[PDB]
Structure 1
Amino acid sequence: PWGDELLNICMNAKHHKRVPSPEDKLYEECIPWKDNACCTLTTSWEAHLDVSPLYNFSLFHCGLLMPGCRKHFIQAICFYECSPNLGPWIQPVGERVVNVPLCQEDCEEWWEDCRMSYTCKSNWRGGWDWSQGKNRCPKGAQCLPFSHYFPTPADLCEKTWSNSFKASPERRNSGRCLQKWFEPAQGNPNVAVARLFASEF
């Protein structure tokens, strides 16, 4: 009826805590989730690594990203790894997450801050040259601005992480979309969203 089954839980993926609980200490961008996290300190740290061991997926493939752009991606990782408010979007493929609605501001700022940075592909979900252990751009793939390969914010949100996220037309504080980062001072705006979606309505 209200999906409490689906509230305050962690997905069964390889890095996740089996159940959420508070953390004394999380690294940088993952701190907003301290209160109650699906990530350990180690996980939160690993989210900030160049070629983070979590996915062995390189952000530098077209060269080092502008720091502003790197920040967005890392936050996305913290969110996926640490959020306890994802139940409604969990699916088995041992579980993943599908079409989590990221508020338009989240996708817009991300897109905006990565405009100057460079990539070679528009579907990062596959088709890379994988020979070094880490992905590199395949034969003939040109490095160009993000705004070329992801013409809209929506493209960026949805395609980088294989439809884990959905770019919502809904804006923030609507009750109906999640933030991939939030200021810890202001308290977690995703809890109510989670509750809403767990419900029949």
Structure 2
Amino acid sequence: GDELLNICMNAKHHKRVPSPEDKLYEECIPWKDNACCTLTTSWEAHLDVSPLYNFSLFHCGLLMPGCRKHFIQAICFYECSPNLGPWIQPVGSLGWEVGERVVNVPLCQEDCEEWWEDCRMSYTCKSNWRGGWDWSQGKNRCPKGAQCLPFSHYFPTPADLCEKTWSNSFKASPERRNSGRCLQKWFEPAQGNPNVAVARLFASGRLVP
């Protein structure tokens, strides 16, 4: 065991501690057995514009279904996973020994490559979603001189998409699946949750104070 295992971040809608949940909605189902998310929250993660965040994915119009799916899974993973412990940090640039987020959670290649492939012909207007948006009509809208173009244009590689959509909550790991050193943002429940072992490895692997 370990203090960085089976914990939830002190964040908005997160539960205090992970616990099972009989019914979890759709994409957020693989975390049913042990989840930092609630049911409500998992529903809300599936909304057109989700009450969880101020953010609109449909700023250039609807994402293609198969693209939207990846974003809902990233949100599920983020709200439900009890295996992010090692990457939980304070909000703001500063060390622990001085409100929480996650930072540099390493996603496997395949998770990022699939996400990018399925989002290829969806549309956005910014190569970095953290920053100069226009909020003059409530939600975020595309800036004045910023044309709606394919994701493959604004996010040239899979790493850009993994990283620049959500402020480096995620890092695009050079590692591949079943390396034991990166997390999937989604996994078939039938097989096991492969991230448990990954959190264990980093909790005791990171030479820290």
TM-score (norm 2): 0.93
Query: Which residue of the other structure, out of 36, 60, 64, is the alignment partner of 1:66?
Result: 64
Alpha-carbon shift at residue 111 of structure 1 (Å):
0.2
Alpha-carbon shift at residue 23 of structure 1 (Å):
0.1
Query: Which residue of the other structure, out of 12, 36, 44, is the alignment partner of 2:10?
Result: 12
Query: Which residue of the other structure, out of 30, 36, 48, is the alignment partner of 2:34?
Result: 36
Partner SS, residue 167 of structure 2:
coil
* Larger relative contact order (Cα-Cα within 8 Å, sequence gap ≥ 6): 1
Greater mean alpha carbon deviation, residues 103-112 or residues 122-131:
122-131
Greater mean alpha carbon deviation, residues 130-139 or residues 102-111:
130-139
Alpha-carbon shift at residue 140 of structure 1 (Å):
1.2
- CA deviations over 1:41-82 (Å, ceiling 9, x no partner): 000001000110101211110011100000000000000000
Instruction: Return the alpha-carbon distance in structure 1 between the equivalents of residues 17 and 138 of structure 2.
Output: 31
Instruction: Return the alpha-carbon distance in structure 2 between the equivalents of residues 37 and 132 of structure 1.
Output: 35
Aligned residues between the structures: 197
- CA deviations over 1:154-188 (Å, ceiling 9, x no partner): 00000000000000010000000000000000110
Instruction: Return the alpha-carbon distance in structure 2 between the equivalents of residues 20 and 184 of structure 1.
Output: 17
Unaligned runs of 5+ in 1: none
Task: Flag the structure with higher helix content.
Answer: 1
Unaligned runs of 5+ in 2: 91-97, 205-209
Instruction: Return the alpha-carbon distance in structure 2 between the equivalents of residues 6 and 170 of structure 1.
Output: 22
Instruction: Return the alpha-carbon distance in structure 2 between the equivalents of residues 126 and 15 of structure 1.
Output: 23
Quote the residue 2:47 is aligned against. Answer: 49
Instruction: Return the alpha-carbon distance in structure 1 between the equivalents of residues 189 and 54 of structure 2.
Output: 29
Instruction: Return the alpha-carbon distance in structure 2 between the equivalents of residues 97 and 158 of structure 1.
Output: 12
Quote the residue 2:142 is aligned against. Answer: 137
Alpha-carbon shift at residue 141 of structure 1 (Å):
0.8
Instruction: Return the alpha-carbon distance in structure 2 between the equivalents of residues 132 and 187 of structure 1.
Output: 44
Quote the residue 2:103 is aligned against. Answer: 98
The alignment's C-alpha RMSD in Å is 1.0
Instruction: Return the alpha-carbon distance in structure 2 between the equivalents of residues 20 and 96 of structure 1.
Output: 16
- Percent of matched pairs sharing the same residue: 100
Quote the residue 1:169 is aligned against. Answer: 174
Instruction: Return the alpha-carbon distance in structure 2 between the equivalents of residues 131 and 83 of structure 1.
Output: 34
Instruction: Return the alpha-carbon distance in structure 2 between the equivalents of residues 27 and 133 of structure 1.
Output: 28
Greater mean alpha carbon deviation, residues 63-72 or residues 85-94:
85-94
Instruction: Return the alpha-carbon distance in structure 2 between the equivalents of residues 72 and 29 of structure 1.
Output: 9
Partner SS, residue 201 of structure 2:
helix
Alpha-carbon shift at residue 14 of structure 1 (Å):
0.9
Runs of 4+ deviating beyond 6 Å: none
